[PDB]
What does this fold into?
Amino acid sequence: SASVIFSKYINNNNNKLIPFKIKNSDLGRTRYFPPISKEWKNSIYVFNHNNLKNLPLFDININSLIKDYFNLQFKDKILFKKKRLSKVKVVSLNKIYASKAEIKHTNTKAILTVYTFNREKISLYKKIKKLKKSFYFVFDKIISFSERVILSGVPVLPWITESHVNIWRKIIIASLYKELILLRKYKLRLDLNKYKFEEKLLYRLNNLIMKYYNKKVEFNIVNMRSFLLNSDILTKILALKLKNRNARVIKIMDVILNKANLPKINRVQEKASLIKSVDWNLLENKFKNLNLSFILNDASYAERNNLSELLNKLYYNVLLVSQKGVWALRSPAQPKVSSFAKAKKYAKIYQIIFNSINYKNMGGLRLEIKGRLTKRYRADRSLFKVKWKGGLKNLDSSYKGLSSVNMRGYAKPNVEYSIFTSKRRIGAFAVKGWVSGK
Amino acid sequence: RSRFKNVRAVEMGLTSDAKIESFTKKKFAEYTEDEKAALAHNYPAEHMEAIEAAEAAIDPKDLTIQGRLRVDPYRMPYIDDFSEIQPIIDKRARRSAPPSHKARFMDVDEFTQDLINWADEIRRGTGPTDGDILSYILERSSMTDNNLQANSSLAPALPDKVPGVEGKYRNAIDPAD
Amino acid sequence: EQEVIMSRMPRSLEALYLQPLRREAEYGVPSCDLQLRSYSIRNLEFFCDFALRAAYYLGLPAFGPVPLPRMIERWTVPKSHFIFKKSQENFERVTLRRLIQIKDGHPETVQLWLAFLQKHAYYGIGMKANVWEFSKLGVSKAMDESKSEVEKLLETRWEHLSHVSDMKGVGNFEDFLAKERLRISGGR
Amino acid sequence: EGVPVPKREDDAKLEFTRPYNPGEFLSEKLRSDDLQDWERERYERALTSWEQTPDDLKRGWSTMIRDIEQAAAPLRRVVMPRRSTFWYEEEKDTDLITNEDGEDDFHENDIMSLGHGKLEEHREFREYARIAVWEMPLLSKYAKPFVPPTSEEVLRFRYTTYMGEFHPADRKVVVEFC
Amino acid sequence: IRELQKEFGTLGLEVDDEVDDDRLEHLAALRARDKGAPKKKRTAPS
Amino acid sequence: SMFRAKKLDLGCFTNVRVLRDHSKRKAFLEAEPERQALRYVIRNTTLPARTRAVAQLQLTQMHAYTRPTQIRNRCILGGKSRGILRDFKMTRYNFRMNALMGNIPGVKKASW
Amino acid sequence: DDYDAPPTEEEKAFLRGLEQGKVTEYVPKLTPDTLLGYGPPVATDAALGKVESAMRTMRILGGGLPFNDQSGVTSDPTAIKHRYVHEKKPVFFSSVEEKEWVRESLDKFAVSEGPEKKTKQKILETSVLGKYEEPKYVESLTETVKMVEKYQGGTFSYAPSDADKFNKKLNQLLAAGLP
RNA sequence: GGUUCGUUCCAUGGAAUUAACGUAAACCCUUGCUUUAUUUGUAAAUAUUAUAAAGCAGUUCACCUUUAUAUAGGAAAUGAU
Ligand SMILES: [K+]
Ligand SMILES: [K+]
Ligand SMILES: [Mg+2]
Ligand SMILES: [Mg+2]
Ligand SMILES: [Mg+2]
It folds into this structure.
């Protein structure tokens, strides 16, 4: 028989049956749910709150640790750069600009996101690319010209040991020392800039950051094309520019705004509202009875029983070649992939994903500078300049009337705000920056 | 007693149990011997073991009594096998080997030997071509790791013309200025 | 060398576009109570469907997701760091949670389910599971007889730990775990 | 100790101060200043091979190194910063100074940071859809069916887990019998 | 940062401590105008 | 002074009183079982009158840092002790500025 | 004459493969072994739950880091060598590949192949078998020491070391209050 | 000059055309309704309290009145809701 206590959990069965009701009311489309990691820097929930009270402080320790990690550079004695002695503090802008980190926590690991603007590669890649292609073609001849002379007798082999290769390599270096250094100077500087985003060096930083969270940290460094698509990177570039005593404040702001291109827009259609009307193309209104039994039981069309056929008429299938009704598969070490992965064309897929993403295009920009920014070394009144281009409004809600999801209860989902604090020789000043997405 | 309601099953005419089976064999029929063989010839062995086990787990009788359409905001907006890892829309793959903590940057001597070894590697198929010198500045390692192609943590880039962004911007600054 | 017209896509791929199927429990005795928590809903509402799918393949009849009462902690702080107290503002921290209850599930199969969710856990979600299991009397004997059975399953897993001969840094073994578990959990 | 002083004793000594040819290079090496006896024969035999070469080949080498010298000419040229420059306004590293033309233009190949959050959120959906289509079906091969408890199963223990977390309440065990 | 300079200092990499480098530059400026700290007295007042 | 570690072990905002309260938390951690025994003997009315009077005198000679009532939570960003929220280890103001910026997870501006 | 030719279509096509990526493979693999280490450390009758509570005991000795067999095989050899040599404490490797990476990265650094016998029994004793010390029942109230053990043995708040500091002071007071 | 809760809207001016912020919209709670989920909440139950994710809803329709014919407003327990 069965246990008595086992029966004491069967009688308590008052479950409510799933009714499979049919919808008789038209449904609208759901709001645009912005990403979750953009609300709070740490997307975390821990049951023991003792692993949650120090994150606001670690955010400052990790940020300063990532900032100094992307600023790493070779020692001038390693590349033979002949450092020019100057006690003055250098202000270099051609480097990697990183933003504030965003961490996705789990009970197993943490994914750290940071948007970088690599300005050091924009100059290094072009500089090394100027080296004529003949350099590599002419060098290849020295390898053949030196083997027929040094590694040969009368004008790899079995009677050629490695001891002679050593002396054969120094002869080439003895004549091409001043040239191999130039190439090596730019080759290492480019590779260092490349490894900072690879595991060759990111595994060392993880060991440092792993000591704060006690979990392996995976990186998601994103590369930015223009430094205006992130307020964190924007407010720092403008700050480093203003630190110079002779910096023209009002002029440095105009050169940055001039670089912020806004898309062409129709001020009428942009501000025009939306009329509430039922969208019969939505998958919720198309089939008011989502049960496959009714949908497939020859409701309107006949012989559409195959569930695959029903889905092909609703979603864009990539496996199909004609785009509808045909999945003809050929019938009778290399990478383990399907025999049609190359035939698949992700042309309309990209157009579906990126069209379902809001706040892509830049449509607003506001810069604020405040503090002691005079030129002379005396007690003078504070300064405050303001420049803007575009609007920081949420068009989808302020004009169209659509419902939006504000972040943290008050903040708009399309604006990014960041502040940077620095100091001149006379006092402190801050740089506030806003950036909105259309 | 059951967990669902039969209200949606009696309308279509599936009161009898035998009539419910005719709805599955006619609409949720399993793969034929030919389709199975043809389907196993395109996918590798590991990808096929997941399909043979799915058709045995998901029985067709469930799809008829409770099979519903997905209309939640988390469903995928398109159909795809998800067999491979795509360039842009998928997370970057990690199929490389771990680095060497004992390896350091190459000096003038080691740098030449690596450059010479590269001149021979390309001279084994004149001189280096555009595809070779370009694969030397961006893919050739500069450390003593035996030309290790580490796995990068850099997120995949976006298309050369992002849909929804292209076709709306005009360069304010003219290069002629 | 011929083209076979496939009649449909694999059921594994079609089921991804249908509501997560659910097995039917014959008895209805709860075998697990998974409570998911998060400060957002889009990650919690998604992982809930992902979990119900894994329970279907394992043969576990899941019930949920049940929306439990959200927890709201409130704080009212002054907007100023000084005298200006006549102006304050309210803050909060809403904790949205769900409950997936499994019934008539094998104890071991329930653990493979909980093991699968921890490996592929979604960021920003917390989990707490209560596992129920029936057992006979004389637990002391059972837990001793099952020593050789567990000693075999650990034969290939002992390779994880490694230490110098006669580890002296641990000292009193039982006291080490007690005071090291506090350091790992931060006080408790 | 005391007031800190600068550290100017930092400099890398170049091996070769001027371009040496195979002849002159081996001569200075074969000068017998610091080298092993048995190794001095290798350089010796090497110098004999070079001097034996015809003058024409020696001429080609001399002109060859001068072709590379001209090939690396545009790479060591000190580019002059633009008049109204933005990035090199105070850049003291002449290596990174470039023309600056079209370095800030937008090629419509990037979205804002707020868009990258919704894009990465899709890459994660596919990662889970790839798991629900290829890895989940394999869970059924190791699943076991539920069997009702027998007459001897009188106890009902409870164990609470936190799924990879250390919580002080994960040590309690609740039992209930009839 | 000191433990970051020692982790990557073995590879020949260098990074400036903008925080400490600023503290040292300010102390040097004070001495330039004779505003630095006095000599630490290490004996009772007498 | 004898409890102040000769090597600073604080990673948060350091202060004169922050370092003074951190030295009191470590002194009590080492003396809680010993201090809990004296408090147990003073209240045990079954022990001899002399045992309770001895345990009562030893508890008075304990250093102030050993007393748990001396411990007072402080802000790890500003070092203050007034208006500290236990759930965040910060003053009410620091909690606001970090909550609005999104540094404190889960916190949200309340409106209802 | 300072002109930089625009990137050619061949160069652009090459940069895409690096930045955007290439079509790599993906081999589905899911076995109880791939899940072993992530399970719930529950003291159930099923051996799967007990084998997980013995692994959780090895992660506590190894430092307390979670079980991560999917985030690389790197580590800090300098800190693992000190903990393994100068501190003489165990080390936990989530995978054999992470163990071989520490070997080839340190100059002649050897690690033991599994723990010792005495360490395997200490793990199974309390984590799996759960052999405790039943707190005896004290009848008379004048038994101070016997009554203190009763309480100390019935709560995980008092660790074996904390119970020593308590008993040391207690015995000192009882003996100092006698004729 | 009208109108509007409102630099709201309409008309007009021998000078206007426009951009940003506030405003408005939207947001959170609350209200009616639909679908979803039924445990730890619910007597039962064919699902109706509660819990909480999404969607819809208003001054919308009807009635009365209405300037320059351009923009609208009124009625408030005995029209609907
Ligand atoms: K119940
Ligand atoms: K309701
Ligand atoms: Mg003075
Ligand atoms: Mg007007
Ligand atoms: Mg408003």
Notes: The CA atoms of residues 30 and 40 of chain D lie 7 Å apart. The interface with chain E takes residues 3-4 of chain D (CB under 8 Å). The longest strand of chain D covers residues 155-161. The two ends of chain D are 81 Å apart (CA to CA).
